[PDB]
Structure formats: structure tokens, C-alpha cells
Copies of this chain bind each other. A is one copy, B any other.
Amino acid sequence: MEFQRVHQQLLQSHHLFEPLSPVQLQELLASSDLVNLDKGAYVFRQGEPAHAFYYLISGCVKIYRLTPEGQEKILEVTNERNTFAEAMMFMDTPNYVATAQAVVPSQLFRFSNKAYLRQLQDNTPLALALLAKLSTRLHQRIDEIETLSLKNATHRVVRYLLTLAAHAPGENCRVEIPVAKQLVAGHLSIQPETFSRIMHRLGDEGIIHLDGREISILDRERLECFE
């Protein structure tokens, strides 16, 4: 009658709970407690002894720090289905170094650090399994970033060309930019190497020709797709 039965599925997808066996998963949930917070509610203050890490189910919780001057400086924002402040465990930190707070009515789980760290201690095969899935998941995240960051790169590139190509539609050949390839990549606040991979890709397909800074557009109808 106590929760359970449906919650185990929410954690079974997370990286920190995958390596754990059904027996160890229930052993950690036994010490856990459901926490409900409202708008402007603090999770843990900067100075309180570290004894538990949290797992957000739904909502938005900010961490940030209490920087000097009297202003809050945001470090990272944790969203749904993601754990935060879990690194404070195996770091052996006695107290919290951040003041967590929820902007919107959020619901979180409170897992004890003493009931999690001790389970990892001894019987290393577990820590070995934890490092296994924790790494394979860290490589898929970088792979996604490599693709997502590339999409934003392919975006600005074409966008910066269309804004100056909007001068006499049909046959676009008037391209300014007193810059020399690489140099313009540093101004657009984007990776220098990516610009030499996107422009060259358009040349291979047969859309945009390159003749040293001199950019000529063959068809504007075939550029509206990727922009």
C-alpha cells in the first residue's frame, strides 16, 4: 500500500540505478522519502551537513551559489528525470556548497548518502558495474552533443548568408563579408573547424560554390530546407 510498484520503473531508466540489482534497488528505496515542494521552496541550504542526494521527477529546481555582493549566480539547472548533487557523495563532502531551490511546484525523492555509499563499498563488482554504464552513457551524451551542436552550426551559417542574400532574389551572387573563411567563424561565435565542414559539404552537393570569400548561390529554393 506504500507507494512502490510503479516508482521502480522511473529509476530503472536512470544511469545510477541501472547497475543496481532489484534487491539493491529496493534496499535503497526503503530509506528514501517522498518530498513535495511549492513555489520558492528550498531543497537544501549552503551550510547544512550533506547526508542525502535528490532525484527530481517533475518540475524545475535551481542550484546556483550564494556569490558575494548579494546576488545569486546560477551554475546549472536540473530538469525532470535527472539526479543532482549526487557527486557530493563519493567526494566525501561534509556539507553542501550550494543552496538548491525550486522555482515551480516540484516533487523530489530523498535518497540517503549513507544508504547508497555503503552499498558501493565492498563487493566492488558493483562499483565496476557502476563505472560501466556510467561511461557508456557519457559517450552517448557527447555523441548527441556532436550532432546537436552541429545542427546549430549548420543553422547560423545559412542564416547569416540569407540575411545578406536577400538582395535581388533569383540568382544570388552578391555576398559581402570582408572576412576570410576561418576568420568569420570566430566572429559568429562558433567552432572554427565546423565552418570548414559545412561550407565544403554544400559544395560537394552542388548548391554553393566557393572561390575565395566570393560566395555564389546557385539555387535559393534548395537552401530553404537547411537553414
Contacts and interface: CB of A to CB of B under 8 A. Distances in A.
Interface of A: 15, 76-79, 82, 84, 86-87, 90-92, 117, 120-122, 124, 127-146, 148-149, 151-152, 155, 159, 163, 224, 226-227
Contact of A136 (B87, B122, B129): B87
A74 to B, nearest CB: 10
B90 A139 contact: no
A78 B146 CA distance: 9
- Consensus secondary structure, chain A interface: helix
A142 B139 contact: no
Contact of A155 (B137, B138, B146, B155): B155
B155 A76 contact: no
B138 A137 contact: yes
Nearest to A156: B155
A86 B137 CA distance: 12
Given A131-B134, A151-B152, A159-B226, 4 more contacts: A87-B139, A90-B131, A90-B135, A152-B155
Contacts of A130: 131
Given A78-B139, A84-B139, A155-B155, A90 B144 contact: no
Nearest to A130: B131
Nearest to A135: B87
A79 B197 CA distance: 15
